[PDB]
From Swiss-Prot, chain A:
It comes from the Eukaryota. It comes from Homo sapiens. PANTHER family: MITOCHONDRIAL 28S RIBOSOMAL PROTEIN S21 (PTHR21109), SMALL RIBOSOMAL SUBUNIT PROTEIN BS21M (PTHR21109:SF13). GO terms for molecular function: RNA binding; structural constituent of ribosome. This is Small ribosomal subunit protein bS21m. The keyword Repressor does not apply. The keyword Ribonucleoprotein applies. One of its GO terms (cellular component) is mitochondrial small ribosomal subunit.
UniProtKB/Swiss-Prot annotation, chain B:
The chain holds residues 58 to 194 of 194 of the full protein. Belongs to the universal ribosomal protein uS11 family. Component of the mitochondrial small ribosomal subunit (mt-SSU). Mature mammalian 55S mitochondrial ribosomes consist of a small (28S) and a large (39S) subunit. The 28S small subunit contains a 12S ribosomal RNA (12S mt-rRNA) and 30 different proteins. The 39S large subunit contains a 16S rRNA (16S mt-rRNA), a copy of mitochondrial valine transfer RNA (mt-tRNA(Val)), which plays an integral structural role, and 52 different proteins. It comes from the Eukaryota. This is Small ribosomal subunit protein uS11m. GO terms for cellular component: mitochondrial inner membrane; mitochondrial small ribosomal subunit; mitochondrion. Keywords: Mitochondrion, Ribonucleoprotein, Ribosomal protein, Transit peptide. The keyword Mitochondrion applies. Transmembrane segments: none annotated.
Curated annotation (Swiss-Prot), chain D:
It is found in: Mitochondrion. It comes from the Eukaryota. InterPro entries: Ribosomal_uS7, Ribosomal_uS7_dom, Ribosomal_uS7_dom_sf. This is Small ribosomal subunit protein uS7m. Keywords: Acetylation, Disease variant, Mitochondrion, Primary mitochondrial disease, Ribonucleoprotein, Ribosomal protein, Transit peptide. It comes from Homo sapiens (Human).
Swiss-Prot record, chain E:
A motif (Cx9C motif 2) lies at residues 65-75. One of its GO terms (cellular component) is fibrillar center. It is found in: Mitochondrion; Nucleus. It comes from Homo sapiens. This is Small ribosomal subunit protein mS37. A motif (Cx9C motif 1) lies at residues 44-54. Component of the mitochondrial small ribosomal subunit (mt-SSU). Mature mammalian 55S mitochondrial ribosomes consist of a small (28S) and a large (39S) subunit. The 28S small subunit contains a 12S ribosomal RNA (12S mt-rRNA) and 30 different proteins. The 39S large subunit contains a 16S rRNA (16S mt-rRNA), a copy of mitochondrial valine transfer RNA (mt-tRNA(Val)), which plays an integral structural role, and 52 different proteins. Belongs to the mitochondrion-specific ribosomal protein mS37 family. Keywords: Disulfide bond, Mitochondrion, Nucleus, Ribonucleoprotein, Ribosomal protein.
Length: 86, 137, 191, 208, 117
RNA sequence: AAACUCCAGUUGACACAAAAUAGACUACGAAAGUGGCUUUAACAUAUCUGAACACACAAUAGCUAAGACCCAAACUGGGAUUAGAUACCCCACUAUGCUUAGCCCUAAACCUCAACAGUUAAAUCAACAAAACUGCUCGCCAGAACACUACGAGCCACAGCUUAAAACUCAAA
């Protein structure tokens, strides 16, 4: 309200391509966490419920990053069988 | 020169122009995309209203207002009244994550207006008023 | 509900009876012509009457549409219309306990004070042999607690193949209420 | 089916066979050497290599057939085509030299154009979203549009509103009406389009 | 870098209160989840709403809306084939990083060992 | 549907309310708790355990008195749903959530895992959960239900809290 306007969350359109500008803006707001934040703020999330959600989201990140690390580590072994027939 | 997605900063000397007008002089299309309605107001850079349209003013009622095609129709209506007043290029400022957030912008383009920038102004309180309690469904 | 709002650019019917903002009758015309008129005059289209076979619409300004809506809400706030009578249903058993019949009797009383219609159905209790004369006694028990408050809108009548009875209760009319008070006063003077 | 999956359907087209070898591509050459090793189903007793064969009229005839009575269904079709041609020869001789140029006298051209004028471009299919089925404007495939045009024409002619009029006179009259973008079959198309337009707000319920 | 797990769970020897309360043991399974089909959405609506717009303006007369009508039919034809193209690529895994079936055979060869042998 | 229509949108001015992101950090505090900025004061114990006979604290809700009031919101009213709907769904609004000054002293106050010291070898170990143990100390427990109850006693508590039984009943829990 007290800040300058047309600086925050503003993307310029290139060659009249408004779809790519909107997708870029939506990608910006998602990566910064604003979209999920706006949605979670529609109804009041009680603190006990917020702590449970954050715990669940943090344990999922650890599991998902650890499973991804194992997939990338083992992906080289997806090559053809060197000892076929034995 | 390479394309910059960052808007030109007022007071600095930019070379970008739209019909001989600077970014600071382009009218603004304010799109309020609510969950049950979409309101579009086109204003001049000096805050002069030029056109207003919403899904309710376009003959949509109740749950039909909260749809994409309803917002698209509201955009076309506002674009038509704005084009008559001399508007071609507009800066879009959209607040809200309703279904007419993107569809309202399509209607502005189909109505003959050129969108040069998109700004999100969805209100996010930094800590603010307590929202209503969750729903049991 | 039917709201007094701009119909929009899309008109349901092809042939439209139109009027002017000043009330001047513009006659019947195609919806396409009406759209041209709305743009030419920069006015919005409202629906004044729908019952008429030729759909009647009127051109109006945004301010005029508001003034009409302001008038209508004052007409209702000042002279509110009664709402449609809501029908409440109860299905009882012949062997219903006396505590549960008092609970449902108190519930029927609250429905009658709100001027609702109470449809009361009584079915034959489970593993019970009962006669229609005994089931019909429950209705009188329910209506005896409401001496001058309720009466039979529809009297007990066998239904569902004669298995169950069914009556409809209502609140006494103002004329019927003054009659009850009159008759009650006469008995007081006699006694 | 009494044909094993190995049996391929027959291709009845004289031109496909007389086509010279040089014009053939390497893909079309492979298909031809392949079919020499494949089993071919017997040709159905409907379609032949005749130059007067029309798959659309043959299909319309089957949709009019009651209880396998093809002889009667075929008789009604050929009686309808003659009734269309005679109605146009009468309109042709009674018209002026200028109007005569615009009058079509071929019943096959009228039959095809009459059906194409009744094909519904958009359809309405029930769609389940949030545990509730909703009628929703949806595109129609080309096969479905042709079928609906035929079924609507046959249904209209079978309506009891027509009293003692024989089918070749009813169908001939309806085809010429639709040929000119008139009649009750065109109205049925406009109704489906109007119902699709009034349910435009419900388009999002579709998931394909 | 994976977030730390030191001192995060309620355990003997860990003085602080637990940071995380996992309802499942934080131990890698020998399988990944199955490819979750993306929610479907209506397509070609833009062309569908241009055709129905002309009908509204031309009394639902197809003669005046031939160009828009053909455009709607082309969009559906292109989208109809897109159903076949995506499905073929979805099974082939042309766009997927790997298929859950292919990714699970690879994990079967290197099973997580949460026990001592 | 009801509700509002001195309503809605843009712009400007404008809190005694709440404290995006950082935080994928894992810190502070005895626990309860504590995540906007600044400053002041300030975070016991140079053995350990130890007060249910004391002392000082103790989320939320609640009580008394004087204030503030955006938003949320028991209750209540209205709309809807239903066989009914004292609910779930929608709207309005109050106590209350905030401040100040006193009370009340309860939580699944649970990380249901006491403090201090030490070990990873032997028998590793009912099961599950968060591997198994040793020394030492205090607290607590002894079939279920009756019973977060009765009585007594204490308490700013008067429909309260703390401590807390028995009879009858069962062959299980
Ligand atoms: K903050
Ligand atoms: K956070
Ligand atoms: K306790
Ligand atoms: K716990
Ligand atoms: Mg009912
Ligand atoms: Mg668990
Ligand atoms: Mg000590
Ligand atoms: Mg307290
Ligand atoms: Mg308080
Ligand atoms: Mg409020
Ligand atoms: Mg208050
Ligand atoms: Mg505060
Ligand atoms: Mg706690
Ligand atoms: Mg405990
Ligand atoms: Mg201790
Ligand atoms: Mg220790
Ligand atoms: Mg015991
Ligand atoms: Mg208690
Ligand atoms: Mg007690
Ligand atoms: Mg006592």
């Amino acid at each position: 309200a007290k800040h300058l306007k047309f600086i925050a969350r503003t993307v310029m359109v290139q060659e009249g391509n408004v779809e790519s500008a909107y997708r870029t803006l939506n990608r910006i707001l998602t990566m910064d966490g604003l979209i999920e934040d706006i949605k979670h703020r529609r109804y009041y999330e009680k603190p006990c419920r917020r702590r449970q959600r954050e715990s669940y989201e943090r344990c999922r990140r650890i599991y998902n990053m650890e499973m991804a690390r194992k997939i990338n580590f083992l992906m080289r072994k997806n090559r053809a069988d060197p000892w076929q027939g034995c | 020169t390479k394309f910059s997605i960052y808007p030109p900063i007022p007071g600095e000397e930019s070379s970008l122009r739209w019909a001989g007008k600077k970014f600071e002089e382009i009218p603004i299309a304010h799109i309020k995309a609510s969950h049950n309605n979409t309101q579009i107001q086109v204003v001049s850079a000096s805050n002069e209203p030029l056109a207003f349209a919403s899904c309710g003013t376009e003959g949509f009622r109740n749950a039909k207002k909260g749809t994409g095609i309803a917002a698209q129709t509201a955009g076309i209506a506002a674009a038509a009244r704005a084009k008559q007043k001399g508007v071609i290029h507009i800066r879009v400022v959209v607040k809200g994550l309703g279904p007419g957030r993107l569809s309202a912008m399509h209607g502005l383009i189909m109505g003959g207006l050129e969108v040069i920038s998109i700004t999100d102004n969805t209100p996010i309180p930094h800590x603010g008023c307590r929202p209503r309690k969750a729903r049991k469904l | 509900k039917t709201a007094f709002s701009n119909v929009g650019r899309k008109i349901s019917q092809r042939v439209i009876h139109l009027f002017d903002e000043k009330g001047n009758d513009l006659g019947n015309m195609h919806r396409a012509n009406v759209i041209r008129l709305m743009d030419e005059r920069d006015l919005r289209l409202v629906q004044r009457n729908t019952s008429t076979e030729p759909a009647e619409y009127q051109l109006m300004t945004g301010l005029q549409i508001l003034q009409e809506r302001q008038r209508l809400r004052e007409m209702e706030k000042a002279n509110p219309k009664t709402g449609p009578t809501l029908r409440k249903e109860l299905i009882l058993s012949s062997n219903i306990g006396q505590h549960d019949l008092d609970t449902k009797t108190k519930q029927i009383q609250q429905w009658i004070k709100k001027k609702h219609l109470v449809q009361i159905t009584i079915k034959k209790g489970k593993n019970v042999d009962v006669s229609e004369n005994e089931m019909e006694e429950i209705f009188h028990q329910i209506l005896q607690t409401m001496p001058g408050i309720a009466t039979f809108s529809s009297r007990p009548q066998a239904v569902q193949g004669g298995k169950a009875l069914m009556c409809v209760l209502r609140a006494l009319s103002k004329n019927e209420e003054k009659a009850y008070k009159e008759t009650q006063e006469t008995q007081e003077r006699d006694t | 089916s009494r044909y094993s999956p190995e049996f391929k359907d027959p291709l009845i087209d004289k031109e496909y066979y007389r086509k010279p070898v040089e014009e053939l591509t390497e893909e079309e050459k492979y298909v031809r050497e392949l079919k020499k090793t494949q089993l071919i189903k017997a040709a159905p007793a409907g379609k032949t290599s005749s130059v007067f064969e029309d798959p659309v009229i043959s299909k319309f005839t089957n949709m009019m057939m009651i209880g396998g009575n093809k002889v009667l269904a075929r008789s009604l079709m050929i009686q309808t085509l003659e009734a269309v041609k005679r109605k146009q020869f009468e309109k042709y001789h009674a018209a002026s030299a200028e109007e005569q140029a615009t009058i079509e006298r071929n019943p096959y051209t009228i039959f095809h154009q009459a059906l194409k004028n009744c094909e519904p471009m958009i359809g309405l299919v029930p769609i389940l979203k949030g545990g509730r089925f909703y009628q929703v404007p949806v595109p129609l495939p080309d096969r479905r549009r042709r079928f609906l045009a035929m079924k609507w024409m046959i249904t209209e002619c079978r309506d009891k509103k027509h009293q003692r009029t024989l089918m070749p006179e009813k169908l001939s009259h309806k085809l010429l009406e639709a040929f000119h973008n008139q009649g009750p079959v065109i109205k049925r198309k406009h109704d489906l389009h109007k119902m699709a337009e009034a349910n435009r707000a419900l388009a999002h319920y579709r998931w394909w | 870098a994976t977030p730390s797990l030191r001192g995060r769970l309620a355990r003997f020897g860990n003085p602080r209160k637990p940071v995380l309360k996992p309802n499942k043991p934080l131990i890698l399974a020998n399988r990944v989840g199955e490819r979750r089909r993306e929610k479907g959405e209506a397509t070609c609506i833009t062309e569908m709403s241009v055709m129905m717009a002309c009908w509204k303006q031309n009394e639902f007369r197809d003669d005046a809306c031939r160009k828009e009508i053909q455009g709607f039919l082309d969009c559906a034809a292109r989208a109809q084939e897109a159903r076949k193209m995506r499905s073929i690529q979805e099974t082939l895994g042309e766009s997927g990083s790997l298929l859950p079936n292919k990714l699970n055979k690879l994990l079967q060869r290197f099973p997580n060992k949460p026990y001592l042998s």
